[PDB]
Amino acid sequence: PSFVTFRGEPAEGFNHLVVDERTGHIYLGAVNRIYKLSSDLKVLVTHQTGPDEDNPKCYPPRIVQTCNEPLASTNNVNKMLLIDYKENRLIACGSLYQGICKLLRLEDLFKLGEPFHKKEHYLSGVNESGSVFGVIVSYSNFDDKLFIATAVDGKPEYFPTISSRKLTKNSEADGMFAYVFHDEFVASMIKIPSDTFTVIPDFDIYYVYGFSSGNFVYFLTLQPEMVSPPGSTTKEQVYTSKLVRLCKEDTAFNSYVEVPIGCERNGVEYRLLQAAYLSKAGAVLGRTLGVRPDDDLLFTVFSKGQKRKMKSLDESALCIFILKQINDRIKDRLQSCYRGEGTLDLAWLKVKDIPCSSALLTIDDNFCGLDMNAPLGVSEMVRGIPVFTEDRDRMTSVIAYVYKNHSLAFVGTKSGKLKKIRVDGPKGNALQYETVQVVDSGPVLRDMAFSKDHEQLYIMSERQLTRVPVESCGQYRSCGECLGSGDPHCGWCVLHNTCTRKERCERSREPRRFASEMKQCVRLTVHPNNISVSQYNVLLVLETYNVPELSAGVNCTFEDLSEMDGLVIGNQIQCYSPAAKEVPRIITENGDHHVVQLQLKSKETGMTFASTSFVFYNCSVHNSCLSCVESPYRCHWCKYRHVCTHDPNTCSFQEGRVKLPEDCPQLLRVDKILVPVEVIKPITLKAKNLPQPQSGQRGYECILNIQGIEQRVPALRFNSSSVQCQNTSYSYEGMEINNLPVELTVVWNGHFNIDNPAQNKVYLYKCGAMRESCGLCLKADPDFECGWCQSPGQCTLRQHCPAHESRWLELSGANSKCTNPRITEIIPVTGPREGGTKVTIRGENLGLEFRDIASHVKVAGVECSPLVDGYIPAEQIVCEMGEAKPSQHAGFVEICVAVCRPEFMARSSQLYYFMTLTLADLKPNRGPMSGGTQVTITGTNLNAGSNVVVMFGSQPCLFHRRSPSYIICNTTSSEEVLDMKVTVQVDRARIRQDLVFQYVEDPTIVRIEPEWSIVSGNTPIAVWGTHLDLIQNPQIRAKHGGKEHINICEVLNATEMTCQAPALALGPDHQSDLTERPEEFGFILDNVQSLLILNKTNFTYYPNPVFEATPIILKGKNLIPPVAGGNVKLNYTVLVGEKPCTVTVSDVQLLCESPNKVMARVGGMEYS
């Protein structure tokens, strides 16, 4: 729905709004315009008040007298607007006339009169809108008047800030705006003293809001710094927001009172009035407030602090004042002055403090003021009761009203939104809703009035008036949701089945017709909660509470699917379930069950109000016993029929029924089923509740699912708990894998598969496709029972190999020597003469125990001692060689399993070679103390042996790769000190040499020569620092956004370095024209971490170019960066397949010339 609105008919401007109590017509004050609108916000009539040639400086405006100062067409701002019902007109006071007021006829806006001639006819020079306010009070003839306050602008002689003026019947009459009682000594007006102006130059009173109460008139005002804040001389101005009051009856103006007003929230001060609204509490607020029905209340809005009235702060607070409380404060104050204590204390009015005079008096609320102790101020600032505070978005305006005794408050925001607040201090709670009827971008004005009928609330913006309805409960579909939202306006109109306010619900007054709390809803229950799919048209009884008389008629709707008529008896509703034809359409694909929300559709409303959980459960679909019983519903399984059904009778016979899950037909597991290939073997099985096949039903079979071949073997069911497939042999083709698990399915009567929860499988295992050697077989599991058979030269089970001799060989428990050990290959081919090398020998048929191999290994003559942990039985031996000093140079490796028997020994195919590695030189001789330098150790025979360790200063170096000629390793920190020695140890040999490594102090980065670069980077950067030579490959690092990137540097001297800037190019973020710092910037110099992130750096990144696909003109953004100084600019080159062109570069375009595919390049970037 959209909100009805009136756009600034003059699209040009807007200032004030008011509603006629009887008609509902809305009058809107604006600059140069005054409009009359319908309740709907249609334009009824437009009046042109505007642009008049004038000048603010001139006193009696041009019409009366000639003004020396030049005039200009200026805008006339509607300062004020007030409806004079009695007079049947509208007082629409403008400005730019020296503030002349106009009278517009109520119905047509016909200008009845606009008195210009006399001085009184001029209100104020002030151009500002809303700084003025006032009230029109009327009585029958010979009793009457207008009270108005306005800012002066330092005009003190010309105009009074507050005045009591006359409103004659005739608009033509000269008398208008004359003071009620004018005397040479005292007039019914209050002027600002000249002395006060001189002291504080700018002092001025701005009147925000005003209202008549009882028999007085109140004004909320803003004033300047007068003793607040203290200051010897003029400087800054801060404001103090105060309340003013007058007796309607006091022609003398003696009754004037002025108290400062504000409120504080947790030590935060809210001094400045934005707007206010007088209203009633209604029964709810009044009771807890402790008030009489008639007693009034004043909602207000204040900004934080004393600063900037012109443009206040966002922080704003809605406070409250009970009029009784303010009246008390005033009475309290007066009764005090009458005591004779202290001074009057009103700075702006009376510069010189006059004392209060004591006197005998009955001080009442009626007290109008007396000659002595005349106009007076107030000491104690009156504090208000806080209600709601907005930090993020400043409140601009407020209104409130009584609804069903609950007090609803309306608050405009700077954003153009309205808040609907139930005030519940006296009750208990907070803010119910927020709305943006208005204007999404920018604010709402103080003139915010409810309509006469109080259906809507006209919300005024600078641009437009918007008719915001006071609730939009209709959005809520169900009683549960309606009451769920909580926005206090909403209730569930039971019979209507809709969500709306009390006023909206017909006959809501009657009992249980309207529901306020969730409890009142609606609660529904169905006796047959669960009905089976198979059943049809079942009788259901409905129990509902807290529902209105249904005699209108009701229908039951399971869902959008179906709807059945119902009859009512007692306090119950009787409906029928859907037909089988209807029910399964739903059930299909939901499977196990489908919960459905059965609703009740009322005949009168035609909307579903009440719901319940209704379950549709069909047993037959279940394919297996587990699903049938074990599932969530009541279903019975028939072992024999092998079907699931609701009825017990349908089962084959009594013994066949499965009520419990434990009882179901399933196969129990036994020790793993091992099955050799090509062997005839029976496979016994255990299980539970196996059915006896009934008539027309066949027996049991075992089906093995082997991809190569699926075997069907019939079986015998001995009893309810045991089965056995008959003697058969199984095989799979491939010889690929030893152990193949296979799924097996036990079936009976052809298709019926018995459930296999464990999912037991049969393991088909085959004898050495894999192992040609005796060592390999004995190595394999003892479970296989597979063993080596000497005569065949092959390996199979005893069953498989004939026994000429009493024995076939099986590793009894590893105590089985094997024969014919072989060595395939060994690692470190070469080694040092000194020894210590770790030789890794890999063979096929070795000894099973370590103990036998130990002492077995020899390299030629040299004794080699094997390592226990390293040794993997019969596959591999890790051995450490001893001192090689012998004459041989090269020798074959020998392993004797237990004993060096002739059958039992193995010799290596290739011989182990002895040679002593040496190291001549290191590529970097020097490096930083922190370390992290890539060292290049050059030498000979560096590759030898097993293990390598490099120690600089006895501290370890981190190894990388090894070669015959070279060892590469990364240096550790020389915490010790500059200089150091290099020791390399391979196995037991430790070689040292004269070559030394010299430690040099961590490098530093002083400065970066351009402070900046572009998004794509690759510009030159001249960096300066210290100990730069110490790092071989320095690089620049930068982190922009999520990603981190690096780039290369070239080191000239110890001090100087040239680096190419890193590319930032990121699709998500682009550097702004202004420029941006990276998340991190630094340099990667080995381990020195401090260099990685530079805290101090103010390096900035400027925006790679964007280009879009006869001379050539290429357009795109980001061609030129805003860079400081010089025309440091990018050197662009647009080239064709090979030739560059002459071009003039502009920020937006590139003017290349082609006399006859293109590539554009600047620095590092290329685009095509």
From Swiss-Prot:
Topology in membrane: Single-pass type I membrane protein
Main location per the UniProt record: membrane
List of glycosylated residues: N618, N970, N1095, N1131
Paired cysteines (S-S): C58-C67, C93-C101, C247-C368, C263-C319, C337-C356, C473-C490, C479-C521, C482-C499, C493-C505, C556-C575
Residue intervals on the Extracellular side: 1-1168
Domain annotation IPT/TIG: ranges: 821-915, 917-1000, 1003-1102, 1105-1168
Keyword Glycoprotein included in the entry's annotation: yes
Stated family: Belongs to the plexin family.
Name used for this protein in its record: Plexin-A4
Organism: Mus musculus
Covered range of the whole protein: 37 to 1221 of 1893
